[PDB]
Structure formats: C-alpha cells, structure tokens
C-alpha cells in the first residue's frame, strides 16, 4: 500500500512505515530514565525469562557508550546492536579528536540523523528501537534524553518507552517531585515497573538497573551498573519482596 516503500508518503500525509516501527517498540519491555539533580537512574526490563534463562551473569539492556554516557534499550536487540556499536565508535571518535568526552546532546543528535537517513534513502528498513540516553557533560550537568524510531529527540526530566507507555507516564508524573533525590527516583522506578509488568513479584533477575552519580570524587563521574544480588537487596527495602 504505502508500506510498500519507505521512500513514499501516504495521501494522509503521515508515513505508515515509521508509525509501524513505533508499534514495534510496544512488543518490547519498559525502560525508564528519571533525571534528578543528584543523579540519573536508568532502569530497564527483561521481557523474556525462564528458569533455565541465564540472566545473572549478563547485561543486555544496559550498554556503556563511553566512560560517562550509557543507554537503556527498548525494542528489537538486533536493531539495537548495530546502532549501539556505531554510537560507541563515534562518541569516542570525538574523544580522540578533541580530547574531551563527547557532549550528551551531540552524540544523540548524530545517532538520530542516521535513523532519518535509513528512512530518507535507499530501500533499507527504518529501525524500531527507542534508546533512553543518560550522560554527564560539564556544559549542562546531568543530561537526559530519549530517542524515537523516527529519528528525533526530546529532553525529559523523566520518560518511559517500551510497552504500556501511556499508563506508565501517568504514574510517574503523579508522583514526581521537582528536586527529587537519587534514592527516591530508584524507588519510583520500581514502583512503576511493578505495575506495568505482569510479573507481580518483580524479581531481581527480571530487572536491570544503572545509576550515574558524581559521588565518586568531584568533577569525576562514576557509572555503576547494578549487579543482580544488589537489585535483590533494594526490593526488600522498598518492600516489594
């Protein structure tokens, strides 16, 4: 119809192919980034589990981009793979050239342009992956963004991608407090994943989590991926288990 090429537009004056790719992101699980002035928590959901699934020796919805920017993953992992690798390469290409770590804003911009190119040119598929980017660069402090499949970006103070977006967003903005705390944000995340996800228990092995903090020294940022057994201790504290 007007799915038939990616380089043709519908008489409505939308593009069905892109819209369709946007629906691709609602067959994968929730990912939540909340920015606080005292840190960013990055949270991700594992949409597949089994009792023989090894998932306790692996990170796969948390990928470090350089030493100061990391992303959370929602969507197809095959789609994700190619763009994460490219992003890591460009961000650190900036490091070589300019002898400073890449600003958060430029690297998202670079990557959103490449997405638009796959729709604009050739007969390639658009990519149905929504990444929440969390970084630190001196020129605007903590910085949070997230990217659409279309190939554009918007800033946020909190955002949710993945499945059941509409509900999840509702829940976040009800319970947000403008100053926030890094600890209160983690707690908020878990509260939200618990409700959108049908895994009622919401166990450690179903959660990936990363916190970006400047608490390690000053002027120096430490990105710490939470490891499984640690994820289990903070569910007791919030009472979920």
């Amino acid at each position: 119809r007007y799915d038939s090429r990616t380089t043709i537009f519908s008489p409505e004056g939308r593009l069905y192919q892109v819209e369709y790719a946007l629906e691709s992101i609602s067959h994968a699980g929730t990912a939540i980034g909340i920015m606080a002035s005292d840190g960013i928590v990055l949270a991700a959901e594992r949409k597949v589990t089994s009792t023989l699934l090894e998932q306790d020796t692996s990170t796969e919805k948390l990928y470090k981009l350089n030493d100061k920017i990391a992303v959370a993953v929602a969507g197809l992992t095959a789609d994700a793979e190619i763009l994460i690798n490219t992003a890591r390469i460009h961000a650190q290409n900036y490091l070589k050239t300019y002898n400073e770590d890449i600003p958060v804003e430029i690297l998202v911009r670079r990557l959103s342009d490449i997405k638009q190119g796959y729709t604009q040119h050739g007969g390639l598929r658009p990519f149905g992956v929504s990444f929440i980017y969390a970084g630190y660069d001196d020129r605007y402090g903590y910085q949070l963004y997230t990217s659409n499949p279309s190939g554009n970006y918007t800033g946020w103070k909190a955002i949710s991608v993945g499945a059941n977006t509409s509900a999840a967003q509702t829940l976040l903005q009800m319970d947000y407090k403008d100053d926030m705390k890094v600890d209160d944000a983690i707690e908020l995340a878990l509260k939200t994943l618990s409700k959108t996800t049908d895994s009622s228990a919401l166990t450690y092995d179903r959660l990936e989590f990363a916190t970006i903090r400047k608490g390690a020294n000053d002027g120096e940022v430490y990105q710490k991926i939470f490891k499984p057994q640690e994820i289990k201790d903070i569910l007791v504290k919030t009472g979920i288990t």
Partner: peptide, 16 residues
C-alpha cells in the same frame, strides 16, 4: 503486504 519483505513491517510490529 505486511509479511513479504524484510523492509516491510506490520501494524502489529516486527517483520514476516
């Protein structure tokens, strides 16, 4: 038309 290339997607996502 939804299932019959690698380039096409569906209103339920994914590729055929």
């Amino acid at each position: 038309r939804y299932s019959f290339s690698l380039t096409t997607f569906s209103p339920s996502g994914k590729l055929g």
